[PDB]
């Protein structure tokens, strides 16, 4: 049946291999709160700037 | 520049973290020896550093 099995060694779980992934448009200039990925903080909307 | 190492204005960068589950107490580096093509009459082996 063409079996395929992954490994997931888990000995280095705290790494940069996470892949949750999402997308939603952001519009600034309003009283909003939001948080994605993670840094423990809230900011203002709209993607990309400087 | 005039200084070979004691100065410089930059920022060092980490690249990739790696686990190694074994005790480490001694280290040694390598060196590459270039093969030198000698004449048949030499009948010897030499390397260029």
UniProtKB/Swiss-Prot annotation, chain B:
Carbohydrate attachment residues: 23
Effect upon mutating residue 41 to V: In strain: Omicron/XBB.1.5, Omicron/EG.5.1
Region of interest called Disordered, as start-end residue ranges on this chain: 35-49
Top-level lineage group: Viruses
Outcome of substituting residue 2 to G: In strain: Omicron/BA.2, Omicron/BA.2.12.1, Omicron/BA.2.75, Omicron/BA.4, Omicron/BA.5, Omicron/BQ.1.1
Effect ascribed to mutating residue 4 to G: In strain: Beta/B.1.351
Stated role: Attaches the virion to the cell membrane by interacting with host receptor, initiating the infection. The major receptor is host ACE2. When S2/S2' has been cleaved, binding to the receptor triggers direct fusion at the cell membrane. When S2/S2' has not been cleaved, binding to the receptor results in internalization of the virus by endocytosis using host TFRC and GRM2 and leading to fusion of the virion membrane with the host endosomal membrane. Alternatively, may use NRP1/NRP2 and integrin as entry receptors.
Subunit: Binds to host ACE2. RBD also interacts with the N-linked glycan on 'Asn-90' of ACE2. Cleavage of S generates a polybasic C-terminal sequence on S1 that binds to host Neuropilin-1 (NRP1) and Neuropilin-2 (NRP2) receptors. Interacts with host integrin alpha-5/beta-1 (ITGA5:ITGB1) and with ACE2 in complex with integrin alpha-5/beta-1 (ITGA5:ITGB1). May interact via cytoplasmic c-terminus with M protein. May interact (via N-terminus) with host bilirubin and biliverdin, thereby preventing antibody binding to the SARS-CoV-2 spike NTD via an allosteric mechanism.
Protein name from the UniProt record: Spike protein S1
Residues of the full protein shown: 212 to 260 of 1273
């Amino acid at each position: 049946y063409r079996v395929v099995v992954l490994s997931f060694e888990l000995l280095h779980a705290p790494a940069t291999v996470c892949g949750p992934k999402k997308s939603t448009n952001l519009v600034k200039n309003k009283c909003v709160n939001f948080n994605f990925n993670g840094l423990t903080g809230t900011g203002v909307l709209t993607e990309s700037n400087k | 520049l005039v200084r070979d190492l004691p100065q410089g204005f930059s920022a060092l960068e980490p690249l990739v973290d790696l686990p190694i589950g074994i005790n480490i107490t001694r280290f040694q580096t390598l060196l590459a020896l270039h093969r030198s093509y000698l004449t048949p009459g030499d009948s010897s082996s030499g390397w260029t550093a």
